[PDB]
Amino acid sequence: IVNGEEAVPGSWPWQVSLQDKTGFHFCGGSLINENWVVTAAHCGVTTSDVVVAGEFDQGSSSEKIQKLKIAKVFKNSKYNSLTINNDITLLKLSTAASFSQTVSAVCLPSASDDFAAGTTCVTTGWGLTRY
Amino acid sequence: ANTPDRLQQASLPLLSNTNCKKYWGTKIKDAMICAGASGVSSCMGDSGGPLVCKKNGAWTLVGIVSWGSSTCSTSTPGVYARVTALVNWVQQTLAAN
């Protein structure tokens, strides 16, 4: 996020970091359940990647995190790799995440609700702070 | 490097798809939702992360970081997967597994 600010640790308890086998962050995701994570289909997640929950600092020597293995990847079949339309993937975890003060789930909307233009929303992540 | 060790956050406004098209045109589809162009922008590494809105006092997943400016310009809105447009598939998938 460019021109963002540091979050209070654990204040976005659904936020997860997706790491490859090398141990590196390539994408974010959100816990919706103790067993499922929602992410983007363009992320190209495989059962080889790991889900990291309850993380704040990616430089920690060791911190109290949860490294969760993925059981199955559910990419939406309507995903268009050229258009980038219907950019969603669900991840079913091998091991359920243990919810706490710092690890919890986000709410999901109904297909019928309206989030109007002008609403102030929030985005979170470990993306670049400057291009 | 321009990589943060700590989790970042930002506040940003939702745009109508009409306003968004002013920037990206035909690239904006029905299952997409834009936000930003207000001095902040999602950048490399934020893909797949949330776009949340408060409703009935609870935070709700409205978007999924999808794509944005090449340069992460803070004057261009970011594009997000519109969860409203895809949650029926999510709900069905959970129901069945």
Partner: peptide
């Protein structure tokens, strides 16, 4: 769901 134990600040 969506009610953090640790309330977020200015976001």
């Amino acid at each position: 769901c969506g009610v953090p134990a640790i309330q977020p600040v200015l976001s």
